[PDB]
Amino acid sequence: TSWSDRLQNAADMPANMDKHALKKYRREAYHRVFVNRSLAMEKIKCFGFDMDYTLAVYKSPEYESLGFELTVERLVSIGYPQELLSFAYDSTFPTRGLVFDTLYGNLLKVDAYGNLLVCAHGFNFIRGPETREQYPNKFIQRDDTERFYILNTLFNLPETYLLACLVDFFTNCPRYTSCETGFKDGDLFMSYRSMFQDVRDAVDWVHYKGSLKEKTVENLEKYVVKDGKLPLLLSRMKEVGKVFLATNSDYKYTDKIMTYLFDFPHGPKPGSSHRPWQSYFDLILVDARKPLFFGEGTVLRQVDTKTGKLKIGTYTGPLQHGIVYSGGSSDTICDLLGAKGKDILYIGDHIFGDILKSKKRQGWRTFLVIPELAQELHVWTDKSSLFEELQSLDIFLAQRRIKKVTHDMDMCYGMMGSLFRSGSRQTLFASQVMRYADLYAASFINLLYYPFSYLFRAAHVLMPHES
Amino acid sequence: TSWSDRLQNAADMPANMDKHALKKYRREAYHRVFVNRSLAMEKIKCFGFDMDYTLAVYKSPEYESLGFELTVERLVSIGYPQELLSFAYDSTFPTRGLVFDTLYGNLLKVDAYGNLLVCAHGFNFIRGPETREQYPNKFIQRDDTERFYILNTLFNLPETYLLACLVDFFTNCPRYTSCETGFKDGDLFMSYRSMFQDVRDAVDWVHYKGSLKEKTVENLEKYVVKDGKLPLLLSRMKEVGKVFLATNSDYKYTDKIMTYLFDFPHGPKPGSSHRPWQSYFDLILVDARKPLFFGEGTVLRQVDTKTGKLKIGTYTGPLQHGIVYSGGSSDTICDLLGAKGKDILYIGDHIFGDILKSKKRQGWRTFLVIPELAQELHVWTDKSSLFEELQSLDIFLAQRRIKKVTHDMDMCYGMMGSLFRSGSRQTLFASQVMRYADLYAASFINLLYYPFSYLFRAAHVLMPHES
Numbered sequence: 024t025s026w027s028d029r030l031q032n033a034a035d036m037p038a039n040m041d042k043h044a045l046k047k048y049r050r051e052a053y054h055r056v057f058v059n060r061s062l063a064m065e066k067i068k069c070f071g072f073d074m075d076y077t078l079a080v081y082k083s084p085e086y087e088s089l090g091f092e093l094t095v096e097r098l099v100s101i102g103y104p105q106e107l108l109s110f111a112y113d114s115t116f117p118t119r120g121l122v123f124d125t126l127y128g129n130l131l132k133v134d135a136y137g138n139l140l141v142c143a144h145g146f147n148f149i150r151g152p153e154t155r156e157q158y159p160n161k162f163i164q165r166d167d168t169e170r171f172y173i174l175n176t177l178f179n180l181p182e183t184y185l186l187a188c189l190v191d192f193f194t195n196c197p198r199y200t201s202c203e204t205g206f207k208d209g210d211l212f213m214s215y216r217s218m219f220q221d222v223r224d225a226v227d228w229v230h231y232k233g234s235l236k237e238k239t240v241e242n243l244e245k246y247v248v249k250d251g252k253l254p255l256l257l258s259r260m261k262e263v264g265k266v267f268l269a270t271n272s273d274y275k276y277t278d279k280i281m282t283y284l285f286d287f288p289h290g291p292k293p294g295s296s297h298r299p300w301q302s303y304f305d306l307i308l309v310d311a312r313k314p315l316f317f318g319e320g321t322v323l324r325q326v327d328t329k330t331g332k333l334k335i336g337t338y339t340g341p342l343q344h345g346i347v348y349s350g351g352s353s354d355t356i357c358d359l360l361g362a363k364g365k366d367i368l369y370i371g372d373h374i375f376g377d378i379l380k381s382k383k384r385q386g387w388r389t390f391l392v393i394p395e396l397a398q399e400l401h402v403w404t405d406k407s408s409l410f411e412e413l414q415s416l417d418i419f420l421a422q423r424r425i426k427k428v429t430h431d432m433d434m435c436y437g438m439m440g441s442l443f444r445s446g447s448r449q450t451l452f453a454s455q456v457m458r459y460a461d462l463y464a465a466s467f468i469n470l471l472y473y474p475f476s477y478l479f480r481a482a483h484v485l486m487p488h489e490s
Numbered sequence: 491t492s493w494s495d496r497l498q499n500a501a502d503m504p505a506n507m508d509k510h511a512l513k514k515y516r517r518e519a520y521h522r523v524f525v526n527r528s529l530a531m532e533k534i535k536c537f538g539f540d541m542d543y544t545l546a547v548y549k550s551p552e553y554e555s556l557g558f559e560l561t562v563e564r565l566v567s568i569g570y571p572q573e574l575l576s577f578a579y580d581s582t583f584p585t586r587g588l589v590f591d592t593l594y595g596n597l598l599k600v601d602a603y604g605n606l607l608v609c610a611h612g613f614n615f616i617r618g619p620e621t622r623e624q625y626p627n628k629f630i631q632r633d634d635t636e637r638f639y640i641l642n643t644l645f646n647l648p649e650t651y652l653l654a655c656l657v658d659f660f661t662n663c664p665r666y667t668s669c670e671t672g673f674k675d676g677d678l679f680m681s682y683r684s685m686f687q688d689v690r691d692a693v694d695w696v697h698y699k700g701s702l703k704e705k706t707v708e709n710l711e712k713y714v715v716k717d718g719k720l721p722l723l724l725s726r727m728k729e730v731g732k733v734f735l736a737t738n739s740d741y742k743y744t745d746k747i748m749t750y751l752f753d754f755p756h757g758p759k760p761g762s763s764h765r766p767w768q769s770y771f772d773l774i775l776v777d778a779r780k781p782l783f784f785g786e787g788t789v790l791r792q793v794d795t796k797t798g799k800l801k802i803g804t805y806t807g808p809l810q811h812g813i814v815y816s817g818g819s820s821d822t823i824c825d826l827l828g829a830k831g832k833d834i835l836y837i838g839d840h841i842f843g844d845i846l847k848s849k850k851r852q853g854w855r856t857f858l859v860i861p862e863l864a865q866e867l868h869v870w871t872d873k874s875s876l877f878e879e880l881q882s883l884d885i886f887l888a889q890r891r892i893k894k895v896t897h898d899m900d901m902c903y904g905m906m907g908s909l910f911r912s913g914s915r916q917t918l919f920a921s922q923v924m925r926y927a928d929l930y931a932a933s934f935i936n937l938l939y940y941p942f943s944y945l946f947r948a949a950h951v952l953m954p955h956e957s
């Protein structure tokens with residue numbers, strides 16, 4: 024059972040909008056909206072959405088495996104060894120939010136301070152003492168973005184596993200000699216940095232020049248979760264405010280995916296006439312280029328929706344019925360919808376590009392979708408006894424049993440552990456969700472289960488000397 | 491009674507090192523070390539110190555008033571109006587950590603997200619609705635460091651008040667016409683930005699080219715807190731580890747101030763021979779240029795301690811008895827003392843340059859000295875009933891009484907409120923202390939009251955879905 028299996032099972036249920044049914048439903052952790060900072064829903068005037076891994080959640084492991092396969096094929100076509108074709112995606116290895124160290128070729132799981140929680144070189148998990156050879160303070164400088172790459176989104180799961188596969192392959196293939204910073208084959212030297220860049224380029228290529236989008240659209244049921252409650256939620260949002268789409272995807276792909284997401288024999292609820300996806304939005308903006316979008320952005324363009332090409336010139340006109348924008352900036356949305364940032368709830372999955380940057384640059388309210396949370400919640404409750412024990416062991420310490428229980432707990436989630444922690448230590452990703460996501464949930468659809476006057480409440484924070 | 495009055499009263503007490511006396515003493519909030527993240531003191535191998543407002547706490551309001559007076563005199567000498575000479579420092583106005591908005595000439599108290607808590611234009615405190623004219627989302631972009639200047643240290647208290655005095659003066663003097671971004675007098679336009687830069691330049695000038703240091707050193711008792719427990723604490727640290735000084739001050743001024751701080755008729759404890767200040771340090775480094783120090787730093791130089799001038803050339807030799815360094819980087823300290831960052835506890839007052847940057851760039855352990863905390867603690871306990879009420883009002887809301895109690899509470903601290911909050915809203919400074927200071931206290935001397943095997947403990951943090 025994957026996180027997307029849980030999501031599709033919930034997606035298959037029709038909405039029961041009886042107020043007592045709703046209250047009961049949202050008490051289950053799977054259907055709850057979690058609160059880091061209080062948010063009065065009554066004050067939200069505009070609801071904005073990302074598309075990929077927000078509205079359109081790709082099924083796992085099918086979509087990751089397709090990405091993986093095509094990326095490997097691209098690498099082989101540019102000259103990587105044929106042995107790559109023997110690799111197969113393994114959903115049990117990668118956890119999201121890992122850091123690839125391009126100098127030494129390690130995948131790192133770190134905390135908010137750059138402290139190392141896990142270090143894997145290929146499939147070799149390095150113990151603490153051995154990590155000090157390369158990381159003398161068991162620490163990385165997060166500001167060193169030329170060296171370290173944070174794998175933030177679900178799109179990065181294939182490459183997370185592929186990087187490990189490659190390091191493992193070159194390390195153990197006798198044609199190559201391993202060095203601290205890469206591999207030698209005769210008179211050719213491949214640094215881990217150059218390897219990483221090829222992988223990144225190949226992932227970008229499959230999405231933009233290769234066949235990934237074509238294969239996705241040709242079997243949408245295989246690759247994309249569909250939920251009849253979506254138009255219901257959006258129609259309800261439009262009753263109390265404005266609704267917008269601001270997505271990095273282009274118009275043609277956005278149209279294909281959105282059409283599928285609304286492909287039911289009804290509109291908002293069973294019995295109602297079907298409505299085009301575009302009708303649910305007061306403003307539609309593609310090619311957003313987030314997070315640049317939340318700074319200077321790019322020139323505002325108009326899409327010719329018949330051809331899917333951009334019209335020539337910068338668009339200088341007003342918001343009109345049926346218009347679709349491309350590029351621009353977050354100021355485009357504020358101006359055209361008559362909104363200030365705190366009037367906007369933006370809903371997306373990219374902790375950096377959707378949530379951190381909209382919060383820090385513009386003071387938008389934020390809702391982070393974390394698709395894996397459904398599965399993480401199952402594990403968290405199902406294995407609560409290991410964490411409970413760890414809590415008691417930590418307290419009684421006021422040590423090797425702590426390491427053993429930490430490992431056993433972490434292994435329940437996968438080889439790279441929970442998205443949110445290693446034992447008692449919170450990950451960078453956890454810390455960023457807390458600090459920048461006002462609300463978060465396994466799915467944006469969980470908003471459906473709360474009234475629009477709801478006050479999401481978080482406890483006031485006190486400093487140690489105030490407590 | 492000022493915060494420095496509280497500190498000097500404690501400084502005047504001799505140490506009672508009876509273990510039961512110590513335990514009793516450190517339970518009083520004034521003498522406690524507060525803990526944001528757990529820290530096992532046994533693992534600390536090196537204790538490092540800043541000088542100004544860490545070891546050498548300047549008396550208030552005398553030192554601020556001297557700085558203020560000299561800065562005003564410098565501004566008048568470059569051509570500012572003679573009316574400036576009628577200003578007098580007022581300790582009741584400034585709180586540390588405010589943001590000067592160079593565009594519109596406002597002092598802002600903000601939270602971690604850039605949300606406005608207080609806005610004063612001169613001495614005119616602007617209400618919420620009126621603030622929206624200039625701050626439409628009641629928000630500033632903290633990343634805009636060319637526009638916004640954060641007044642982080644106690645050295646910035648004079649200029650905090652001076653900026654307000656100037657805006658007030660020019661606004662109300664009929665020789666000038668007020669504009670959104672500055673003041674006109676005939677064919678001369680003075681932007682708030684240019685005004686700010688003159689003030690900053692004048693403060694730097696008084697400290698580096700003017701008479702402030704001379705006046706300070708000529709009456710050390712008037713201007714600097716002295717505490718006979720200092721050599722006791724340092725001697726104890728040297729028993730279990732290494733001790734270093736890394737200060738932005740130059741050798742001559744460092745020597746004057748340090749000599750005063752150790753000027754007692756005894757060494758570590760009454761009855762013992764007096765020892766030169768330098769003897770308490772395994773490494774002494776001046777002209778540190780923090781926070782650049784924690785990145786590339788500057789060339790390592792050697793001080794000629796007889797003349798106080800730097801020797802010509804980069805110093806390429808070893809750590810030797812009696813050597814004093816200038817410049818270099820944090821790597822100088824790690825290499826020469828045989829330390830990794832997590833082995834080092836660095837103690838300083840600069841939230842950005844001492845604490846945030848050492849933590850983020852190098853993974854050092856951190857101790858933030860907050861001299862005002864003594865007074866803030868008095869107010870926090872003495873007026874606990876107003877905060878208690880605010881807590882209850884916030885809960886019962888699940889509004890104008892909330893604003894009234896918030897104001898009354900804040901006014902107990904000064905016109906700009908508490909360093910740490912406005913009502914229920916934490917300030918940026920509070921948030922940064924929590925996130926980057928592992929430990930914090932009113933004085934570094936509070937470490938004396940804990941054994942060196944002490945485990946400072948903070949509760950494990952949980953996300954909302956884990957709770």
Ligand SMILES: Nc1ncnc2c1ncn2[C@@H]1O[C@H](CO)[C@@H](O)[C@H]1O
Binds near residue numbers: 168175
């Ligand atoms: N999750 C993230 N992904 C990518 N870059 C990030 C992330 N979090 C912070 N940063 C950037 O990395 C640097 C801080 O380590 C800054 O440039 C910051 O903008």
Ligand SMILES: Nc1ncnc2c1ncn2[C@@H]1O[C@H](CO)[C@@H](O)[C@H]1O
Binds near residue numbers: 151
């Ligand atoms: N997926 C994994 N497989 C094997 N060992 C792991 C894994 N993740 C962490 N560890 C190990 O557990 C120890 C820390 O709990 C470390 O030695 C680390 O190598």
Ligand SMILES: Nc1ncnc2c1ncn2[C@@H]1O[C@H](CO)[C@@H](O)[C@H]1O
Binds near residue numbers: 632633634635642922
């Ligand atoms: N307290 C502070 N004082 C000055 N600059 C800061 C402070 N906190 C963060 N910054 C800097 O301001 C920018 C983030 O708002 C970054 O360049 C960061 O390094």
Ligand SMILES: Nc1ncnc2c1ncn2[C@@H]1O[C@H](CO)[C@@H](O)[C@H]1O
Binds near residue numbers: 615900906
């Ligand atoms: N020092 C002050 N003097 C007068 N009013 C203040 C002060 N600080 C905040 N306020 C006011 O209290 C209100 C918010 O509680 C705002 O109108 C703000 O102007």
Ligand SMILES: [Mg+2]
Binds near residue numbers: 073074075076077371
């Ligand atoms: Mg997305």
Ligand SMILES: [Mg+2]
Binds near residue numbers: 541543838839
């Ligand atoms: Mg200092």
